[PDB]
Paper text:
Major histocompatibility complex (MHC) class I molecules (MHC I) present antigen peptides to the surface of antigen presenting cells (APCs) to active T cells through interaction with T-cell receptors (TCRs), which play pivotal roles in antiviral defense. In this study, we screened bat MHC I Ptal-N*01:01–binding peptides from different bat-borne viruses (HeV, EBOV, MERS-CoV, and H17N10) and determined the structures of bat MHC class I complexed with these viral peptides. The overall structures of Ptal-N*01:01 display the common characteristics of classical MHC I molecules in other mammals, with the extracellular region of the heavy chain folding into three different domains. The α1 and α2 domains construct a typical PBG that contains two α1-helices and eight β-sheets, and the α3 domain and β2m display typical immunoglobulin (Ig) domains and underpin the peptide binding domain.
The structures of Ptal-N*01:01 with the 9-mer peptides HeV2 (DYINTNVLP) and H17N10-NP (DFEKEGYSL) showed that both of the peptides adopt similar overall conformations as the HLA-A*0201–presented 9-mer peptide GL9 (GILGFVFTL) with a Leu at the PΩ site. Detailed analysis indicated that Asp59, Arg65, and the P1-Asp of the peptides in all six structures of Ptal-N*01:01 form a triangular network of hydrogen bonds. Although Ptal-N*01:01 can bind peptides with Leu as the PΩ anchor, the binding peptides can also possess Pro at this position.
Residue numbers in the entry:
A (entry chain B): 1 to 99
B (entry chain A): -2 to 277
C (entry chain C): 1 to 9
Write the structure that this text describes.
Amino acid sequence: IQRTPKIQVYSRHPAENGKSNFLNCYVSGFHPSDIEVDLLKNGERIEKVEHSDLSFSKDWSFYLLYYTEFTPTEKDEYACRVNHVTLSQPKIVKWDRDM
Amino acid sequence: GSHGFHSLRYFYTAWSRPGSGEPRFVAVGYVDDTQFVRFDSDNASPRAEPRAPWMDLVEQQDPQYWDRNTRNARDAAQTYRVGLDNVRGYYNQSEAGSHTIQRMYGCDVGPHGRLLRGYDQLAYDGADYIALNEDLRSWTAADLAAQNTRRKWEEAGYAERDRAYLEGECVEWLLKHLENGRETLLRADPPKTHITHHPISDREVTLRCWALGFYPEEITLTWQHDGEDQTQEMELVETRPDGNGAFQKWAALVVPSGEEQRYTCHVQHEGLPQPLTLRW
Amino acid sequence: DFEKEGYSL
């Protein structure tokens, strides 16, 4: 039983340039639990990334929230990069202030 | 009016890592939708740790809480490190493969303070393995290899000890947490709602209805066209955590460039005095 | 509290 992860990238609060915020990558619905999640700023890995404690849903699939403080601006591209044993290549979901 | 009901739930995850050391074991506890405790076996001298505000105050009511729970978690970790190889033996799987045991147990309490449902379920590699029946008296093994565990657990009188916990400490500790975490757990934070407007062309626009910062997680977002539901035509994302103990959700809908005024968004949530109707 | 009990599968 293997399950590919679902990904959402988003901010805690609505993005206002210059104001401190939190960049979130929520990965859910995957199995098994080993997963690689990086948060990217203009293609480069952000180093101080934290994540929630591993848990799972009624169907036994895991979910995790990766997050880091960031101050959004214009032209500053942000993204979440996810790899898992069910993915032949890493998956990248860009952050869209509008979702 | 609706009678309250609350839940205390614990989640165990243990998986083997061939070639990368001993199996890992991670456990977490939740009261309703708020995590309050964690434990990771990989940590250096691992201890049970608080993960909610009110748990920072539990030490003055019960100065033994953390020692008691650290011992139990360390004992649970050892039990599942062994159980990984026991179950692998039941299936005759190779040692080079990684495998996972999961466990979810807890109790639902009614508005009166008495137990409604107790539960204890285990998975192996993400599929049902064994589960405590609703009577809390017997087990239900999911396949032939799991019958090994049920026989061992039947002959050891485990169900009676499980049931004793579920009707006992679980109920008592849910009620203790509900009082100490009252400001966090008994709140009904309504969603901060608004509509955003994204032109895609000269003739089509996206209308997105947002719900932000609400707790509990349960919520309903619908789009309407003159009064007609729009579920098939709308994109509804899965409810997600905001990282501050609350949740978000949105529903978007592609709409002709002159017809925005004819669509409404409807939000129902326990924190709302009345259901909300929004319009662009 | 966590379940003080336990039995290996």
